[PDB]
Design a protein around this ligand. Structure first.
Ligand SMILES: [Mn+2]
Lengths: 161, 612
DNA sequence: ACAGATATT
């Protein structure tokens, strides 16, 4: 069941270690793919995962990311607004997303309106990137054609002003 | 056989304007004992009998409210005693004008007294003072009858007859007590606080000797506005933001400058990326061109607040100076009443006549003549309030007969009136959207079509741009040097007088005639200083006062407390709430606050010890 | 030495 589960998660786009899957594995030895997807999605990604992104993803000399990939948001900042205001309507909303895979970190820029990732999105929310996605000057480009927001729930973001 | 009739108006101007209308020319010149009023006679019939009319004026507010002579001395009364243990009496304002005895000697006839005073709360106060003065001397009522009547009017041209016959009601003591309660509250709330502060700070700090520290329901929040802007200006950290600007060459050397669709980027690497996607690319396409007709809407009718704001901002005159100049102009008869909050014109207004009067001045002659020939647009509908008509010119004026600040204010008043009567501005807003890679830029321009009120206010004009090229989409304009500009956020500057007046009006602090007085008071008490473009920079005294107030029961400075007290006064006036109960409740609440303040003053003391 | 608000002609 381990091999078929690993293949199913690979197809679905989740890259989780064997120990992470076993931790996400429920009491029965029988594991349902949707059930483990839900359980893992509820948990923080830094504990469970595997090395997906290249070690130099934050240096610019990659320029491409291929295949499905699940990533965890950690901090969202509105670049087009001052740090004091953070909600001014004097600029189109551009979001800088600090994404993690559990081992390294990458930074992504909105580059277009999403209507699915907002400044109220809690850290721990997970996003799936599908198809080829562009990297320029060490920044991921997040158009609406590849970012799918899976509704996450993690206990962070307790204090906000 | 003839029965005497008495009538009282507020100023002898209204006395003339009412007698000449209600008497059909039969008047008299009977200058009174005081030497400042007039008595007018007439013959009529209000209750089916020949009655000899009599009509006079009580100029200004008759009696003021002040403490007894024992408690006015600063060194003999404990300030707290001013809250509840201090009697208060109604003295006669400007006693050299013996108004009370004038009224008493003129009042000898019964069966008729009416009240042609202002139709506001001030008018109710004045009228009940007049009735108090006049009843003890008038003739006794014979059996059951009504002797006291009141007339209500918003104009004195032809409504006066209908008011004289039908609209003969009674005065409203409930609303006439609201102003008395306000006076008593304000006097007791001040006086005591300022006396305590003055006797405390004049015996502890040398540099404050022979200086007055004043607290009031309107002065202190006014200072607090400037102090909070000072807190914001000294509690701001500049932030660096990068704006990407690129230019294109349209035909030969037009050098069209564009601005980025995303107006700013508060990051360095992101801005460098967005430059790297645009720098090395040499062409630029166009995606959308939009030509839209838009209208810059005409100004409303002038009121005192907007007049003061414009005098402070554009003309360069203080609020008290502007108010004094307006009062002087009204006294000479050039303009109308200058303290009015009515941005709406009355239905029966001679707009054509007022505009035709200003048809022989070499600054507005052509515009006024063309406007009268073509037609006049109806003025914008505004917020009427019933307190006198808006400020409008009433007589032709020229540089020779008045000069300086008087002319500089008259010019603005006349131009505002003409602009209100004139047409509306129209301009083409042409926006062109360029694409210089995976990046969008835009360029906007304005082109006037029919200058309306712009022709009479050449400071609301649309700036002259050099037009935009007619692009048909799919162009291939060459680009220039796409540069990443580095900029810093600018800290806010100190409050201007116009902004302070706007805050006063928004929060209800002060009235149409007390805003300049409050601003001048905070300026002369060495709390704020006027600097550059009429900016009110707070001084050390203002900073320490407002900060200490924030530390010590911080609700004596917030603008909301004055609004709450005013709501209580309105509840008094309408009738829902009583008078003595609310008087005592507010007095005791603020007495508790003052007792807290007196023993908590150590915070303000230690906050002042850092300064002088 | 005071509040605020108003102020003929
Ligand atoms: Mn009045």
């Amino acid at each position: 069941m381990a091999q078929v589960a690993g293949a199913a998660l690979s197809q679905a786009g989740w890259y989780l270690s064997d120990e992470g899957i076993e931790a996400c594995t429920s009491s029965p030895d029988k594991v349902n793919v949707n059930d483990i997807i839900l359980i893992a999605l509820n948990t923080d990604l830094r504990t469970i995962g595997k090395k997906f992104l290249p070690s130099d993803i934050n240096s610019g000399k990659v320029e491409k990311l291929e295949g499905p990939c699940v990533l965890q948001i950690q901090k969202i900042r509105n670049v087009a607004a001052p740090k004091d205001n953070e909600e001014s309507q004097a600029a189109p909303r551009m979001l800088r997303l600090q994404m993690t895979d559990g081992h390294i970190s990458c930074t992504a820029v909105e580059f277009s309106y999403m209507s699915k990732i907002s400044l109220n999105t809690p850290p721990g929310t997970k996003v799936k990137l599908s198809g080829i996605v562009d990297i320029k000057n060490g920044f991921l480009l997040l158009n609406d054609s590849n970012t799918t927001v899976l509704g996450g729930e993690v206990e962070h973001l307790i204090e906000k002003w | 056989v003839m029965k005497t009739v008495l009538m009282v108006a507020e100023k002898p101007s209204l006395a003339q304007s009412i007698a000449k209308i209600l008497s059909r020319g039969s008047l008299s010149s009977h200058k009174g004992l005081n030497g400042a009023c007039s008595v007018h006679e007439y013959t009529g019939t209000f209750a089916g009998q020949p009655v000899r009319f009599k009509m006079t004026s009580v100029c200004g507010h008759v009696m003021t409210l002040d403490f007894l002579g024992k408690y006015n001395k600063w060194d003999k009364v404990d300030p707290a005693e001013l809250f509840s243990q201090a009697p208060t009496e109604k003295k006669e304002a400007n006693p050299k004008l013996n108004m009370v005895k004038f009224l008493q000697v003129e009042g000898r006839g019964c069966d008729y007294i009416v009240l042609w005073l202002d139709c506001d709360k001030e008018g109710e106060n004045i009228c009940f003072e007049v009735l108090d003065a006049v009843l003890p001397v008038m003739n006794k009522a014979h059996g059951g009858e009504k002797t006291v009547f009141r007339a209500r009017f918003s104009s004195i041209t032809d409504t006066d007859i209908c008011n004289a016959m039908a609209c003969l009601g009674e005065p409203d003591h409930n609303e006439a007590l609201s102003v008395d309660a306000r006076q008593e509250l304000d006097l007791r709330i001040g006086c005591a606080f300022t006396r305590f502060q003055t006797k405390y700070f004049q015996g502890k700090y040398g540099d404050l000797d022979s200086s007055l520290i004043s607290f009031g329901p309107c002065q202190t929040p006014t200072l607090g506005f400037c102090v909070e802007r000072h807190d914001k200006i000294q509690s701001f950290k500049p932030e660096t933001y990068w704006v990407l600007q690129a230019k294109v060459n349209t035909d030969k050397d037009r050098s069209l400058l564009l601005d980025w669709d995303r107006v700013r980027v508060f990051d360095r690497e992101i801005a460098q990326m967005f430059l790297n996607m645009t720098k090395l690319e040499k062409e630029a396409q166009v995606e959308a061109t939009s030509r839209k007709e838009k209208a810059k809407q005409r100004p409303l009718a002038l009121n005192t607040v907007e007049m003061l704001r414009v005098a402070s901002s554009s003309l360069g005159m203080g609020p008290q100076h502007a108010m004094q100049t307006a009062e002087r102009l009204y006294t000479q008869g050039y303009i109308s009443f200058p303290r009015t909050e009515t941005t709406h014109y009355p239905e029966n207004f001679d707009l054509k006549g007022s505009l035709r009067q200003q048809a022989n001045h070499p600054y507005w002659a052509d515009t006024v003549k063309r406007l009268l020939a073509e037609g006049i647009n109806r003025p914008r509908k505004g917020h009427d309030a019933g307190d006198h008509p808006p400020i409008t010119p009433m007589k032709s004026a020229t540089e020779a007969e008045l000069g300086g600040d008087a002319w500089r204010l008259y010019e603005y008043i006349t131009r505002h009136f003409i602009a209100t009567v004139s047409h509306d501005c129209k301009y083409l807003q042409s926006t062109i959207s360029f694409r210089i890679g995976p990046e969008l830029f835009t360029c906007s321009g304005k082109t006037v079509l029919s200058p309306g009120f712009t022709e009479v206010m050449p400071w609301q004009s649309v700036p002259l741009e050099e037009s935009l090229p007619t692009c048909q989409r799919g162009d291939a304009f060459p680009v220039g040097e796409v540069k990443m500009l580095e900029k810093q956020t600018n800290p806010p500057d100190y409050l201007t007088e116009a902004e302070l007046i706007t805050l006063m009006e928004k929060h209800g602090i002060g009235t149409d005639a007390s805003i300049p007085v409050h601003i001048n008071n905070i300026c002369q008490r060495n709390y704020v200083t006027v600097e550059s473009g009429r900016r009110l920079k707070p001084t050390n005294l203002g900073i320490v006062l407002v900060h200490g107030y924030y530390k010590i029961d911080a609700e004596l400075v917030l603008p909301t407390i004055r609004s709450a007290v005013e709501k209580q006064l309105n509840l008094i006036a309408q009738g829902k709430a009583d008078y003595r109960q609310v008087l005592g409740h507010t007095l005791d609440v603020f007495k508790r606050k003052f007792h807290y303040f007196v023993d908590s003053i150590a915070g303000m003391d230690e906050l002042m010890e850092v300064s002088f």
